[PDB]
Amino acid sequence: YNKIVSHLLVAEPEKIYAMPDPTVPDSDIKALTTLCDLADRELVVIIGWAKHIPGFSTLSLADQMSLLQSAWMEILILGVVYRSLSFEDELVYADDYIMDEDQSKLAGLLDLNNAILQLVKKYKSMKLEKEEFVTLKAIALANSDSMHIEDVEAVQKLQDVLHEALQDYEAGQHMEDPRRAGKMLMTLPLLRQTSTKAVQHFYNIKLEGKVPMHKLFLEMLEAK
Amino acid sequence: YNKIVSHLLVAEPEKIYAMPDPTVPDSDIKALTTLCDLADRELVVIIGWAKHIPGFSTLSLADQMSLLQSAWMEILILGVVYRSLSFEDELVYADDYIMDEDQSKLAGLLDLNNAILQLVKKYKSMKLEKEEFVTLKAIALANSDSMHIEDVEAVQKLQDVLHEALQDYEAGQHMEDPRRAGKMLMTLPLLRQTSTKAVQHFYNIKLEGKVPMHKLFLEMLEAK
Amino acid sequence: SLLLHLLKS
Amino acid sequence: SLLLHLLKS
Ligand SMILES: Cc1cc(N)c2nc(N)sc2c1
Numbered sequence A, B: 001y002n003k004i005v006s007h008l009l010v011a012e013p014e015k016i017y018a019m020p021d022p023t024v025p026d027s028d029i030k031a032l033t034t035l036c037d038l039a040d041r042e043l044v045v046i047i048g049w050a051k052h053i054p055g056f057s058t059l060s061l062a063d064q065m066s067l068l069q070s071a072w073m074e075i076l077i078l079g080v081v082y083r084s085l086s087f088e089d090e091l092v093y094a095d096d097y098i099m100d101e102d103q104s105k106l107a108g109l110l111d112l113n114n115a116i117l118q119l120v121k122k123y124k125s126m127k128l129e130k131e132e133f134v135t136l137k138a139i140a141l142a143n144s145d146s147m148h149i150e151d152v153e154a155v156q157k158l159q160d161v162l163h164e165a166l167q168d169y170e171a172g173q174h175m176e177d178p179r180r181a182g183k184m185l186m187t188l189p190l191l192r193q194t195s196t197k198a199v200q201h202f203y204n205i206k207l208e209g210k211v212p213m214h215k216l217f218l219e220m221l222e223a224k
Numbered sequence C, D: 001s002l003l004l005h006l007l008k009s
């Protein structure tokens, strides 16, 4: 199929383990610490991944920063959603950190994790493929609606290139449904909604000051 | 062109005046009262409009309620955005209620109105047509991602019918850009983001208890 | 529900 | 900015 889609597949970062501290008692603080640590490490690999997306590294460093500051939590959430598609009512944050409903309630995350499971339900019913996942993650970055963009035209061109790759992929692989690309685009509002909820939830955990957070995670929470 | 698009054009409700009370001193309370009154009246016409959308009235009353409870603020905001496309840095809530930056600051709405003006900027650059506006408002209703749907398949079918109308419209009217329908779908995340911001902002004005609100507006704010 | 009333009317 | 540092590295 499509070269952009095959490129994004090879660019996909390796799996990251959560490694919850086995010496620490189970608690909301432990679960939130574990998840913020996991996000901080994944943010480093997301920054390296973005540089493989055609055209991203040609933007100004200000525009690269702006796109990542608006999209980072969408990119993190799509990863959790993709890993969870084979599971039932469980979120695969990592292979060693799978959260069921009881664990979500214990971490104060039931409402957020229920919205993430809504994303999973719709992608399961649409039989989301890895090809579509990686292309939607790149589109989410390009379409993140930063208020701070310098080169509006170059960011539109990045959107168009990635949109064209999704449409060409679907035209070739899914002739049974000539509107499947647009169905995939219509999944992006719920991702935006769930990301905004997540950022607000963890910004409030930051303000409460009971969960240690590493520098990069903090930098991205603070950006908004 | 497309019969669904022509149907939605004739279904479009008439203009509503704001009629800010000329006896009341200008204040944040007056501006917020005026806007909540205007939303309450527009919500009545939105409910009647939705019944003209093919298939909507065949859903259960529970599903009709669910779609409107999730989408109402998106529908209100798209109306303001469409009315504003010929203006510069001003929001046309009504022909008698046009808010500039100073007025937005006076009403405590600068951050919300700046996000609405971001929607306006992108639709102006895409030369949004009334045909596209009315079709995107119907798609926003159908694609509103309620957690409470009974008939998931019937709501997907409503999405597909309206998606097909947008795609058929763009295939006929915009042959120069074979991906314009998908560009229009890619505007929906910012609408979702701006709607969630607006609902949270007015829910907080509700809790503070200084702005009288009519029954229907309150019912829709409370739903979330 | 006023919403239900208007949807029925 | 750690974000800027990583984008430059
Ligand atoms: C919502 C959410 C929160 C996190 N901390 C997180 N970390 C990942 N690696 S994905 C993700 C998602």
Ligand SMILES: Cc1cc(N)c2nc(N)sc2c1
Pocket (backbone or CB within 6 Å): B035, B036, B038, B039, B042, B076, B077, B079, B080, B093, B198
């Ligand atoms: C954001 C917003 C708030 C309102 N009160 C309102 N009223 C309309 N008729 S559109 C709208 C949008």
